[PDB]
Design a protein around this ligand. Structure first.
Ligand SMILES: Nc1ncnc2c1ncn2[C@@H]1O[C@H](COP(=O)(O)OP(=O)(O)O)[C@@H](O)[C@H]1O
Ligand SMILES: Nc1ncnc2c1ncn2[C@@H]1O[C@H](COP(=O)(O)OP(=O)(O)O)[C@@H](O)[C@H]1O
Ligand SMILES: [Mg+2]
Ligand SMILES: [Mg+2]
Lengths: 49, 518, 40, 121
């Protein structure tokens, strides 16, 4: 049952990917970097510029 | 910040190609492994076939998408190179294209994906080579194991005990197992006749003819002296225009007597060499056999076989050791083929079959006759025998043997995921996707057998992670077990050719960005 | 009734061949998993 | 999905269709079995009428389109050629055990197992 949970996580996390792609930036790398920033410093208010 | 790439048609075309390839792969997904059940194809005309070979299924099915056509060409190329795995290669190609569709959605250039797939294939070939073990000929046990494994996923599986030993004996009786480096399947003549059951298949070291004996007075010959004929046993006629003019009443008697004497001369020269069975080549523009000639041949107690195809002369000469004659002056016993016995057998009212058996001269050729109730099982049986022969050809080509039942590709998936974890960059995701798109084969083997795909694949990954290599799906046990102890192995060339061909054709597909109607 | 009394006998060939041919034909037709009917 | 330009029948549908075709052929041939069986009349398009009881002649004269029934017709013809007697019996047996095997399969029993069971039986 964790497969469905991870699929849900990815599916809801596509929204920053679409946001960055619409913004012109590379989606995957920017999204991974901002996620790493969010997990390193406990500041959950970091989003796609 | 970056290129706008206003054109969106390339993305649409790429996704259409990926979707078509995935659909084609899913179409034959359920026709893989021992538990996969074959497809039924009926073309425009009312002709049907019961096919389990992926190449045949894809060829008969008239597809319309360019990706599907490239996939069917891939399948036929894999059949040509190896002869087994023509379903698994298509499944792998479609599955990893479906894997790369999300890579395209993630904002990755197709060239990066193609190069990363090439690198992943390069690593995977080495992984497969390391996983293998050496295989050497004259070990009949492992050859029988490979033949049975090749035949397990076919309708003739229950006959494999009486059909795989002869399948490998056919190859072992054609090529020298010391210095071969290749074998030929042209000199393995598969002759099919309707009637009987599969358990009546036979392997003959001699020669098999579907022709019929002209003189219905002689049926069997002991200590046969076979002689091919390439000229014609009829009234003489020159290459250029031939004409005879008669001006007197005695001339008719003269021409009739002279023609009879000429034919009798030819038949006497044929008979005086000790030839007791004659083989006439199928000749046109000149009657190969005359009724008077056939009468004389029958009078001198001979057996005559006529209407023999031109392309079969090489096969007959290689089988029974005879040499063709195109002039009567060169017809001598010193170059006349010999055999222990020649028989004409009626097949329980289903046909008439000619056997030349016990050829004293050596014969580097065997013949398989396949029997079945209806025609569909006969076609599928000859296709399965061809698959087993191609497997033995793969074993002869390069001597490397690996395990099966999902073990090779799942071990490859583990090793390639571990390799991708040390490839930080934009290619890490691509190598990871390539690694995780080769778990489609174990998943398909699990779900086609009624097993639980998720738990089976997870337990397989766990087992191979601990280094318990050559561990795969077992359908007799209904679970996961060591496969080598279960006697299921396949040559390495099949897997390597499948992987390499799939990767190359996927790179070619990725290079496409547009389709235009001409 | 005892068929030996009435004499109803058939050669064993008919039974053996019928059984083998029937079971093999059923095996061949039962392997079908799906059908693709191509348009003429 | 697939671009084949044809018709595709997958799963239980085609299995049931094959079983129905075999049962239809068996039902045509069944009434002409036994000493009490009454023979059939086969009349052509132009009026060429014949009266027959043997299964091989009935099936050969009939026009069959479904290949799953063409298989049974060819089975009857083969039984006629190799033996001569028992042509209706082979068709009846084949269709009945095909129906029984399909009944087994409907309960999610893998057809390879039923094929091996029939072969050993
Ligand atoms: N007895 C068996 N047990 C487990 N797996 C098997 C067995 N026989 C074949 N397989 C697997 O089924 C896969 C498909 O093989 P097969 O259908 O015979 O030819 P192809 O590879 O062309 O589909 C192979 O990769 C093989 O590993
Ligand atoms: N006198 C009899 N008493 C009992 N059973 C009989 C008798 N005659 C025939 N039968 C049975 O009836 C069946 C009739 O088969 P039949 O339809 O004649 O064979 P076919 O299918 O070749 O026409 C046979 O299986 C036979 O066992
Ligand atoms: Mg195979
Ligand atoms: Mg009868």
């Amino acid at each position: 049952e964790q497969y469905a949970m991870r699929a849900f996580a990815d599916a809801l996390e596509v929204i920053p990917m679409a946001l960055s792609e619409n913004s012109g930036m590379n989606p995957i790398q920017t999204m991974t970097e901002v996620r790493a920033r969010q997990v390193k410093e406990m500041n959950p208010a970091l989003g796609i510029d | 910040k970056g290129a706008y790439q206003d054109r969106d048609k390339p993305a649409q075309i790429r996704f259409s190609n990926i979707s078509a390839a995935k659909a084609v792969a899913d179409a034959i997904r359920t026709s893989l492994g021992p538990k996969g059940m074959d497809k039924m194809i009926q073309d425009g005309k009312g002709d049907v076939t019961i096919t389990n070979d992926g190449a045949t299924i894809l060829k008969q099915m008239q597809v319309l998408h360019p990706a599907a056509r490239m996939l069917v060409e891939l399948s036929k190329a894999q059949d040509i190179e190896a002869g087994d795995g023509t379903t698994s290669v298509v499944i792998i190609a479609g599955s990893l294209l479906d894997s790369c569709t999300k890579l395209l959605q993630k904002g990755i250039h197709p060239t990066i994906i193609s190069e990363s797939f090439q690198k992943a294939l390069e690593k995977g070939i080495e992984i497969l080579t390391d996983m293998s073990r050496p295989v050497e000929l004259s070990d009949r046990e492992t050859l029988l194991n490979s033949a049975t494994t090749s035949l397990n996923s076919k309708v003739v599986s229950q006959y494999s005990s009486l059909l795989s030993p002869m399948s490998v004996n056919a190859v072992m009786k054609v090529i020298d197992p010391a210095t071969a480096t290749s074998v030929d399947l042209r000199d393995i003549k598969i002759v099919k006749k309707l009637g009987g059951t599969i358990d009546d298949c036979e392997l003959v070291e001699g020669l098999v003819l579907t022709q019929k004996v002209s003189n219905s007075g002689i049926t069997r010959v002991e200590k046969a002296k076979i002689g091919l004929i390439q000229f014609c046993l009829s009234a003489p006629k020159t290459d250029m225009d031939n004409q005879i003019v008669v001006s007197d009443y005695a001339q008719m008697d003269r021409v009739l007597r002279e023609e009879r004497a000429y034919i009798l001369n030819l038949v006497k020269q044929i008979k005086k060499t000790g030839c007791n069975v004659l083989l006439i080549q199928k000749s046109i523009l000149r009657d190969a056999l005359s009724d008077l000639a056939l009468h004389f041949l029958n009078k001198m107690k001979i057996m005559v076989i006529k209407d023999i195809e031109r392309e079969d002369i090489e096969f007959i000469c290689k089988t029974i050791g005879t040499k063709p004659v195109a002039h009567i002056d060169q017809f001598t016993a010193d170059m006349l083929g010999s055999a222990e016995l020649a028989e004409e057998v009626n097949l329980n009212g289903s046909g008439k079959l000619l056997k030349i058996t016990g050829c004293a001269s050596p014969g580097k050729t065997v013949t398989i006759v396949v029997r079945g109730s209806n025609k569909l099982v006969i076609e599928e049986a000859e296709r399965s025998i061809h698959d087993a022969l191609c497997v033995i050809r793969c074993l002869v080509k390069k001597r490397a043997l690996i395990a099966g039942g999902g073990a090779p590709e799942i071990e490859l998936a583990l090793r390639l995921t571990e390799y991708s974890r040390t490839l930080s960059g934009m290619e890490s995701y691509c190598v990871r996707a390539f690694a995780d798109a080769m778990e489609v084969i174990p998943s398909t083997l699990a779900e086609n057998a009624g097993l639980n795909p998720i738990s089976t694949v997870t337990e397989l990954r766990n087992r191979h992670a601990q280094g318990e290599k050559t561990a795969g799906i077992n359908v007799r046990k209904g679970g996961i077990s060591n496969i080598l102890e279960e006697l299921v192995v396949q040559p390495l060339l099949v897997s390597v050719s499948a992987l390499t061909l799939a990767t190359e054709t996927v790179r070619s597909i990725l290079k496409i960005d547009d389709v235009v109607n001409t | 009734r005892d068929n030996k009394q009435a004499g109803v006998f058939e050669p064993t060939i008919v039974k053996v061949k019928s059984l083998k041919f029937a079971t093999e034909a059923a095996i061949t037709i039962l392997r079908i998993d799906d059908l693709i009917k191509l348009h003429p | 999905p697939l671009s084949v330009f044809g018709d595709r029948s997958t799963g239980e549908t085609i299995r049931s269709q094959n079983v129905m075709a075999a049962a239809s052929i068996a039902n045509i041939v069944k009434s002409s079995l036994g000493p009490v069986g009454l023979d059939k009349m086969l009349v052509d398009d132009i009026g060429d009428v014949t009266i027959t009881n043997d299964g091989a002649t009935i099936l050969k004269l009939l026009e069959v389109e479904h290949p799953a029934a063409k298989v049974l017709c060819e089975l009857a013809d083969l039984q006629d050629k190799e033996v001569g007697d028992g042509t209706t019996s082979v068709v009846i047996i084949a269709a009945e055990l095909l129906k029984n095997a399909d009944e087994l399969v409907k309960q999610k029993i893998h057809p390879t197992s039923v094929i091996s069971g029939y072969r050993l039986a």
